[PDB]
Structure formats: C-alpha cells, structure tokens
Ligand binder design. Structure first.
Ligand SMILES: COCCn1cc(-c2ccnc3c(NCc4ccc(OC(C)C)cc4)cccc23)cn1
Ligand SMILES: COCCn1cc(-c2ccnc3c(NCc4ccc(OC(C)C)cc4)cccc23)cn1
Lengths: 289, 238, 49, 99, 38, 238, 289, 38
C-alpha cells in the first residue's frame, strides 16, 4: 500500500517471546516475497525515534545530476586541403557513450524525463597567439530534417529548426528539451527489432529517436588553426521510472548493444564478479590485536 | 499448528517445525523475586538480554551403545558469556531456564529419547560407601554420562522418572523438546557454585536404529536463563 | 549435523540473500566505483559520422 | 538478492552463489563466514542493497540475511548463524560466536 | 523562479515522498503473516 | 556548610570534610540517552549499581619536581570491575563520570593543584613532525605525566585551561575536588577502546612546600561512571 | 540562566557600605567559579546607561568570514615529457593548512556549519603573449569515489559527482556545501584513533571526512606554457559551537597533529610565552614627564 | 534574497542573542552569594 515516507522507521522496544506456533524468523523464499522478519522479532530492542531523512535516495535526486553525454574535438582552420570535421560536426544523439550515466539509467526499464542540456566549449591553439572569442551555432535536426553538409551551407539558416548561438566567453549555453518519445516513456531496454523486415536493428526502440545535434563555428577561419572541444551535459528532470533492473556488472563494449566480455580476472570477470578469497572460512580484513 | 514453535529471547531465536507442544514445569512460569519473598537487602542487578538468551552447548553423538547424558544447572552455564561473568562476580544468583533439545534423523530412523528435568538430582555412586566427590558432580559445560540410567544413578528408577517435568523425542513424531523451568529451590536465592537446582537428563529408552546408510546423529542442547538476578557483588571467583 | 539417508545426496546447498530493512538510509551521492571506461565504446565514434 | 558467499577459486559462475554443506564427524564445526564490508570487494558487493549503496558514502540501519536450505526433503539439520559486533577478530569457535 | 511559458522548462520536482515497496518485496496474492508462512 | 560533602553511588561512599563546593561541567548532569537522540536500535543493557560506583585508581606521589598527571576516560577504567567487563563485551558504550580527587597535608604545608577535566584532549608531541603513537596515548589505569604542562602538551596554555571544567586543591583551603561530567561526544554513543571523551588533568601550579618533617603526600583519584549504557553485545575483546 | 543580551550592562550608582558579615570582594577560586564581585561593590559608582552593542562578538560573526583553505599552482602546458600536476590537481580537503583560519576554529571543540566556497583563479605566462580566458572544472569526489588520473580521463564526465565549470574572466566561482558530518557536529579535536587496529591515525575523527577536490583546466594545452594558481576560500555559516578551548600559543608544525616546538626565544617559546621584563617591579612602557 | 530550494544555501544567521555565560563562569552546584563564599 502506497504511503508517504519522509524518514526511516522507528524501532519499538521488545520483550522476551516463547510463543508456540509463532515463528517470525522462518520464511519461504520460494514464494518470491522478501523476508518480513522485523528486528523487534529477532532480538530484544530498545525504543529509537529515527530522524534520518530519505530524500537523497529519491529517484529525482538520484538521476537529476548533469552528466557528460557527448564530447567532440575538431580543428577550427582553413580546411580547403583537408580530407575531417571541417569547422562543424554532426552528432547522432544517444545516452549510451559514457558509462557512468549509462549505468545509472540502465537501473530502470522505463523512464520519462525532460532533458536539461548544458553545452561547454573550450579552445586551444594548435602547436601561441591568444584565444579567440568565437561564436558557435548548435542546431537540433529532428528525424527526417536535412543535416548541414558544410560550415556555410544554407541549412544553418534555421528557419524552423531550433538553434542556439553562444560565445566561448559566455557561461555554458543551456536549454531544456521536453520529453519527446512517441510513447509515454522511453524504453531504456528494448527486446525487439526496429523494422518490419528481419534485418532491422535489435535493441533500439524506434519510438525513442531524438535526432541530430549539429554544431558549427560561425566565424570564418583565422590565419591560424585552433582545436575546439564541445562537451554536452544532460540532466534528466521531472522523472518517472518503472521496473528496476539488475545493475551492469561486466564492462560495456558497445553503444549499440548489451554485448559483454568481462574483465580478464575477477573482479567483474565473466566467471567471477566478486574477487576471490582463500576459502569460505577466510576473513579477508580480520581485525587482529 | 502446535508442531511449529519459535522462541525469541534477547538477540537469539530458535525455530522448530516438528515440536510436540512444550512443557511448563509444574505449570509455573519464571518470574523475578517479589519484595515479600526477598531476603538479601541490596539492590539486585537484572542484566536482562545480556543473560536471558540461548546458550548452545557442545553436541553429543547418539550411538547404539549410549547410556544417556546429563547437565547440571547453573553449573553448565557458570563459565559462558555474560551469565558466567555475573555468576563469577556475585555471591547470590536466581533464575529460571528455557531448555531446548534438538535431534533430527530420517523417516527411516527410529529411536526415543526421554528428556527430563530433575530438581535436586543428588547422585549416588555404584557399589561403594564413599559419597560422590566434587569432580564426579561438577562437570560444567561438557556434562556427564549416566552410569546406570535404569536407576537414574540414584537407586530409584527410570520407569518412574516421568513424575518429573519431561518430554520425549520420538524420532518418528518430533525432532525437538522444550521445557520451561521456574526457580526451584528452598531458598529464594543461592550461591551458584555449590548447588545445582536442576539436572537436564537425556536418556535413550529406545535405541537409535535404521537400515539406511549411517550418519552421525547428534543431540544438541540450547539453554536460556530466564529472569536472572544477582546479589552480593565482589571480585570474581572465576 | 546434516543428516541424510543413503538415497539423498550427501551434500546440500544454502543460498544466502541480503536486503536492507526499512530503517535503512543512504547519504552523500558519489560516483560508483563499479563501472569505468578506458576508451570510447565501439560505434561511439560512428555517431559522429 | 543473492550473496556471492562462495567467492573462491574453483567456483565458476553460478557455483559462486551457493554454499555446499556436508555431514561432519566432529561437533560444533565452522561452516563459513561472511565479510560484511560493503565498500571492499566481497559477497555483499554485487547485491541490490550493495550496488545501490555504492552510489552513496554514508549509510545507517539494519540488514537482514535470509538463508534457503536446498537439500532434499529427507535431509535434516540445525545451524547457528551469528553476528559479531566489531572490535575483535572474527570468531572461529561456536562457543565464542554464540555470545 | 520560472518565467518560461512551457511548464517542462521548470526546475526539478524533488517533493514526491510516496512509496510502495510491497510491489517489489511482497508481490504475492495472499499477504503473509507476521503462523508459518507456508 | 558546603565544606562537607558525601557522595553515595552503588555500594560505595565518599565523605570529605574540606570540599570547595563542586563543579557540574557546563551546568549539565549525566542522563541516559533519550529515544529521540538514539541511533543503535538494540535494547541497551543498563547495569546500574554494578557499574555506577566509585573506582579508586593507584595513588601518585606529589614531589617538588612533579609536572602533573593525567588519565583518559574511559581508557583508565576499561579493565576495572564490571565496568571493564561491560566495555570489553560491547561495541558501544555511553556514560557520564563523577571525579573525586583527594590530597591532604598539614596546616604547615602549601601547594596548589589545578584539577581540570579536558574534553577531547588530543595530545601533541614535542619537537617532531610524527604524531603521537598508540602507546603514548593509551596509558590505562596508570595514566600519564605531563611533558610540558605549561602548554598542556598540546601547544596551547595552562593559563587558559580554566575555560575547562575545573577546581583547585589549595592545601590551605581544601583537601578535595569534585567534578561531575556529562556525556561529551559528537555521537550519542561510542566505541570505548578507540576514543577518549575526557582527560582528567592534575597540575601543580604551586609546588608542594613545607618546613615540617617531610611525609609522602599522595594524590588519589576516585571515579564513578554515571548512567552507563552498553550496546552491541558480542564476545569480549579483552 | 539563558537570557537575550543585545548590549553591555548598565552600571547603577552605589553608596558607602560598612556592613558586617558582607565581603563581596572576597572570593574562592578553588570552587572553579569566576569572581562575582561587581564594580558597584568594589567602588562608589555613578549611573551609566550603556548602549554598546555586542553583535560583533557573536560566534556567527566571529567565524563567518571567508578565509583561504587551499592554494595550488600548476603548469598549463603540453605535459608529454614531464615527470607534476599535468593540467589538473587533486586536493584532500582539510581546514588545517593556513594558520589564521586554523587557530580561530580551534578555539572550539565542536562545530556544526555549512561551508560557503569561493574559488579564485589567476594565470601568468611562463618566462609575454596575453592571458587566455580558460575554462576550469572543479569536481567534488566524495569518499570511495574514484579520482581522475589524467586531464582527459572519463572520470571528468561527472555523471553523479557535483562539478562546477567556471571561466577565469568570470567572478570567482561560488557554491555552498552543507554540513555533512556523520555526527551532529564536527570534532575539531579528536582524542582518539581512526581505525579498529592500533596503527590508525591519531587525532582525526573519521566521521569528519569531506573528500577530494579535483580541478582541471578543460582547454587543451596551448603552444606556450602558463602557470595557473587556484585559491579556495571557505566561509562557515549557520554555525553552532561547543566547548571553548585555550588558544594555540606555539607555532603550528603539521596539518596532521598538534605537535609543538615553540619559537627559539620569547614570545611564544616553549619555556616563555610572554616576552621578558627586567623584573616583576619593572614597568616596560612607563610614562615619564 | 534566497531562491534556492535547499535551506542550507541561505545567507548567514546573525540574530541569536541568547547567552548563558554561567555555564562557564559559575558551574558550581550551589549558587554563590552576592556572606563569605565558603
Ligand atoms: C534513458 O535514456 C533513453 C532516452 N533518451 C533521452 C535522450 C535525450 C533526449 C533529448 N535530448 C538529448 C540530448 N540533447 C542534445 C540537444 C538537443 C537539442 C538541442 O537544441 C539546441 C541546438 C537548440 C541541444 C542539445 C542529449 C542526449 C540525450 C538526449 C536520449 N535518449
Ligand atoms: C573545523 O573544521 C572541521 C570540519 N571541516 C569542515 C570542512 C569542509 C567541509 C566542506 N567543504 C570544505 C571545503 N570545500 C571544498 C569544495 C568541495 C566541493 C566542491 O564542489 C564543487 C566542485 C561542485 C567545491 C569545493 C574546503 C575546506 C573544508 C571543507 C573541513 N573540515
């Protein structure tokens, strides 16, 4: 039954028992229920009035932290001879590339959230002259819209795409993207295929497609080359979460799938998640005096 | 229903799924000494959960030649945990006891143990005029073995021992026995090192038998002191 | 002791489980040391192509 | 969620999630111990309580361990399970752990 | 402080303290006794 | 009137005919931990008179070259009587203390002792970067001697030590000092073997002197734990 | 008895006394009480209505001033050949390194406060080209979280750690950290050992561990080297304080302990805190006309 | 001015004028007379 829980539960004092037919420490794991044995039933307890808050494990607080989702470096230079990100890049938006954010999200089967996006830009001179205060354009290109082909192509005129223009000397650029799934929640895992034929992608719900992020430098090239790094941070907010999952144990291999190998030896090997001890009777950090 | 039992005392708990009710000796329950029966005028210590908890003794092997086993109370517990420490530092003690005896076997085994709590089990020696000595009586946690269980080592009889608080473990029926002992003494308190109120006796009136492959069949004793009080604090005899 | 007849297996298993009770509280969020990456994942570069 | 109590060499995969018990010919014998440090690598780490707690730094409150016996119906036995509060070495004898 | 027109722009909602752990801890059709459970 | 005092706790009593009132540290009195401050959920043992009684330490000789003496609490009592036994078997302890310091001399003697209870007396070492080791800190019942009482062995000063709960024994005026210490910790309970809440310090700011025939002038410390509670029962560390 | 005190006390006029059995100038220091002699009892006084406020000695005002807690300089350069803080540093957070803040805090045994943190950054060219407007990342790494190993390691993706990104041209970066002790107050002094064995640290309460501050430059290196200095300031606020202590007299030796040596001669020598005068009858600054 | 959600973010609290110096100046069990004090 649903109830409002702001603090951890109190403990009541308890007496000696010795009641026939009452065995609160016995349980039946086969039912699939977790043990209902209370501490007051296992031991004699005192009264404790418990004031510890539980707000820091709220799902909103657990997930609504800004985390790196994308990082791209490209040369800001005259590109006429290059073969390369020619003062712009395109990124196909995903949550799977950086493992710390990926593992937290993959604790759940379904998520509904709005995404707070922070864009941080940094510049370095190619191997010094000072650093230019460049203007950047980020443009969101939804599904079926055309991506830019050049730094100066007319796609950047952004008649109906959302664009943000920001300087390097500004605070990081920030926007919110709404929850935009064609379903009521994102499918964090998808035991299915994307297309009506048999060759479609396994494991990616088509319903969750966000689109492309296109970032250009708006300035014409200078006489000298710079390296520009763009970092994108996502913070989920207004979160609903359904069906908690076993956490990832083996290292991630791919953004595209759940494939696994394990580490070569424990911990987090395929044959042994926990590191070994000499025996089930060995206490590894035993206090001795 | 009354084949399942849970006992909770202090930080300890025992469950059995094959009880045969349980015995409250003479229909009494343990209690603290009331003011209208008290003698020693100092304020008692009542450690509660530090003492009033199950202590498990060393198990004994049930073998076809066994005569049976005994433990004296408080002697068997006088060196165990915080009960032992309170015993060693106090002139006077008082408590009840909760006794739980455990023995399981297969559905192909047979055998019956009489589990009997005897008050003032003053032992006799066999075939001598000399009274039993201190080392014959004071066995501690290990307990003793019956010399002549047929006469309870006291020239009386096993046959009439059912006049004392008892249960049976009949391997076909049950795997545990429980007896609750009140304080049982002529004085309201006693010196714990020189007098035993109760003797637990476990006697195999029907021997263990089977035609399956043999296993070790142990008997295990768990005892919880109940409503412990101690008076006359001094240095530990220990 | 563990006591079994001849036709049972002479060796038996326990499974141990753990959970928190509802008096349990956690505080001060941190990066979990359980996961890490030494390099880009496979196909992470291909998201830029 | 299951503890990885048998985190030993020569336990592979699923074998690490169960502890095997045999008939003994000596009384009062030790069967296994469980390291209780959730931060250091041990039987508790890869558990639901363990994994979620490792996103946090501070913790409070009681734990429950449940054990399921998976012998045959004809198998009988009694075990004692002991928790020792900290300060000394892990007990190696039953009459110590019993306290 | 939220002067934006769309409500999804607002700051995070850290106020929902409703819990029902029994949907994960006790998803049994018959609720268990605090008699033996089977 | 307030030059005479009797203290009665458990089976122990002390009388003095030459007190100088007594100190209650920060105006507090010892108390048990209330339910709205408690953390550990197990039921505590509260031994009362078994623990809450005066223990007398070994006396120290007041000599013209003395630098002064210190004892750490609970360390100095962790091996004494039933307080020591409860300490050794429990993870957590809590108590106040009653401290009574005794020193008498003739009407021809002079000398003054500062008797000060210091909370969290974290010691420094002299003339090294290496922190004090375990054997420098944990002296037990014997206690320690000040290396540099002028800076309290902590680089602060004796002169300002009167900010702590204190009395003086000025031999012309009084022969005893009494300080009542509440529980003084950031946590509601603590592990008794790794942290000391209080240090008793006795420092001879005015040296002992006379022109009578010399006698041994001892200083004696008696300490009563007050409202002792223990949590987390296990085997004895001991 | 507790009372509200906003101003210093008034003085009442007083007459001549000569009362038998009444001796307000006599006291008994042995009790441990401070003298209760009032000025009106020692001398004939006038009436003075006293308007002097006492707010500047409030413990909140006394301690809630921003003070330097950490100062680190490191080279911002291409580090491929260096042996050094390679565009980032790690700091183990403590209050003991700068003596002015340390001595004020050590006037108390227990403190509870939230910490207002100000991060000030400055840059100089290595031995001139102008100064770059770099972006920095500070990341708080709590106990048991992994610290970054490189300027560009994936730990900086900060999925659940709090990070602040700030420019050199910005105002100093500022955040508040809550009171985060596992006890109800910090132990400013700790007469105890950190571990259950005997070899643990003396003098540091494990309950007070804050964690690590990790600061990187986010920009790639320029063709030329710069020296970057980061200064961290802490201001305690919302302060409760318990058990006042004798102030430190001898110079501090170590951040790790209370060890002492003294100055070689007075003042603040181990044998003589106050500087000498020729005799107890010598007046050192005696007015003569 | 405090628009942050957590209350520990607020500016300093310089308003608590309660004092009780007698817990340091006169921690004696019997309060002293303003008769001789012993
Ligand atoms: C558990 O997760 C499964 C569900 N899931 C949600 C997302 C997601 C949704 C919306 N956005 C995202 C983003 N945002 C980049 C961005 C977009 C538009 C912008 O617009 C400006 C150019 C005006 C700026 C930046 C970066 C990374 C991920 C997302 C991905 N998967
Ligand atoms: C009497 O004193 C004993 C108690 N005591 C309190 C503190 C303390 C607490 C919290 N903080 C501190 C800090 N803060 C650095 C900081 C942390 C996180 C940051 O987060 C950003 C990266 C997002 C930024 C800076 C610097 C120095 C000290 C502290 C230390 N000892």
């Amino acid at each position: 039954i649903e109830s409002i829980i702001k603090t951890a539960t109190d403990t009541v004092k308890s007496e000696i028992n010795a009641e026939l037919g009452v065995v609160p420490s016995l349980n039946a794991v086969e039912t699939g229920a977790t043990s209902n044995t209370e501490p007051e039933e296992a031991i004699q307890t005192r009264t404790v009035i418990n004031q510890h808050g539980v707000s820091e494990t709220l799902v909103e607080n657990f997930l609504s932290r800004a985390a790196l989702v994308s990082k791209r470096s490209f040369e800001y230079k005259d590109h006429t001879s290059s073969t390369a990100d020619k003062n712009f890049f395109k990124w196909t938006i995903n949550t799977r590339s950086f493992v710390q954010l990926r593992r937290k999200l993959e604790l759940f089967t379904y998520l509904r959230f709005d995404a707070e996006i922070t864009i941080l830009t940094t510049v370095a001179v190619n191997g010094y002259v000072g650093l230019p205060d460049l203007t950047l354009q980020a443009m969101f290109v939804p599904t079926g819209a055309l991506t830019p082909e050049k730094q100066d192509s007319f796609h950047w005129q952004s008649g109906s795409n959302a664009s943000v223009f920001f300087k390097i000397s500004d605070p990081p650029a920030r926007i919110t993207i709404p929850f935009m799934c064609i379903n009521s929640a994102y499918s964090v895992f998808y035991d299915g295929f994307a297309g009506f034929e048999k060759n479609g992608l396994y494991g990616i719900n088509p319903a969750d497609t966000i689109g492309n992020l296109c970032v250009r430098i708006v300035n014409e090239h200078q006489p000298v080359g710079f390296t520009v790094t763009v970092r994108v941070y996502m913070k989920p907010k207004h979160i609903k979460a359904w069906a908690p999952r076993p956490p990832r144990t083996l290292p991630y291999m791919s953004i595209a799938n759940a494939n696994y190998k394990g580490k070569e030896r424990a911990p987090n090997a395929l044959s042994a998640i926990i590191g070994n001890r000499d025996s089930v009777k060995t206490m590894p950090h035993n206090i001795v005096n | 229903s009354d084949r399942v039992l849970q006992l909770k005392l202090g930080n300890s708990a025992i469950v059995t799924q094959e009880a045969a009710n349980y015995c409250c000796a003479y229909g009494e329950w343990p209690n603290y000494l009331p003011d209208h029966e008290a003698v020693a005028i100092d304020k008692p210590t009542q450690p509660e959960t530090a003492t009033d908890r199950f202590y498990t003794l060393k198990s004994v092997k049930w073998e076809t030649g066994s005569t049976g086993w005994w433990w004296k109370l408080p002697d068997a517990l006088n060196n165990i945990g915080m009960f032992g420490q309170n015993v060693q530092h106090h002139y006077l003690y008082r408590s009840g006891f909760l006794i739980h005896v455990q023995c399981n076997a297969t559905k192909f085994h047979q055998g019956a143990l009489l589990v009997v709590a005897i008050p003032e089990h003053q032992r006799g020696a066999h075939n001598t005029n000399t009274s039993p000595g201190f080392d014959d009586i004071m066995k501690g946690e290990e307990g003793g073995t019956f010399n002549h269980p047929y006469v309870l080592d006291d020239g009386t009889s096993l046959a009439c021992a059912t006049i004392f608080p008892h249960q049976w473990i009949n391997l076909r029926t049950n795997n545990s026995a429980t007896i609750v002992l009140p304080w049982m003494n002529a004085a309201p308190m006693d010196f714990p090192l020189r007098h035993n109120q109760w003797t637990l006796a476990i006697i195999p009136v029907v021997p263990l038998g089977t035609r399956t492959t043999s296993s070790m069949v142990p008997i295990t004793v768990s005892i919880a002191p109940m409503c412990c009080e101690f008076n006359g604090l001094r240095h530990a005899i220990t | 002791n563990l006591i079994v007849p001849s036709e049972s297996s002479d060796t038996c298993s326990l499974i141990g489980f753990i959970a928190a009770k509802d008096d349990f509280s956690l505080r001060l969020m941190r990066d979990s040391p359980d996961i890490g990456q030494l390099d880009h994942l496979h196909a992470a570069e291909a998201a830029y192509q | 969620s299951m503890m990885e109590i048998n985190n030993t060499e020569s336990a592979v995969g699923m074998e690490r999630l169960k502890v095997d018990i045999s008939a003994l010919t000596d009384v009062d014998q030790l069967l296994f111990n469980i390291p209780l440090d959730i931060q250091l690598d041990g039987p508790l780490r890869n558990t639901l309580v363990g994994n979620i707690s490792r996103y946090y730094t501070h913790w409070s409150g009681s734990l429950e361990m449940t054990f399921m016996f998976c012998g045959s119906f004809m198998a009988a036995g009694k075990l004692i399970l002991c928790y020792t509060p900290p300060g000394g070495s892990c007990p190696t004898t039953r009459e110590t752990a019993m306290l | 402080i939220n002067f934006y027109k769309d409500s999804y722009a607002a700051s995070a909602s850290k106020q929902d303290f409703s819990q029902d752990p029994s949907k994960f801890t006790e998803p049994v059709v018959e609720g268990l006794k605090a008699a033996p459970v089977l």
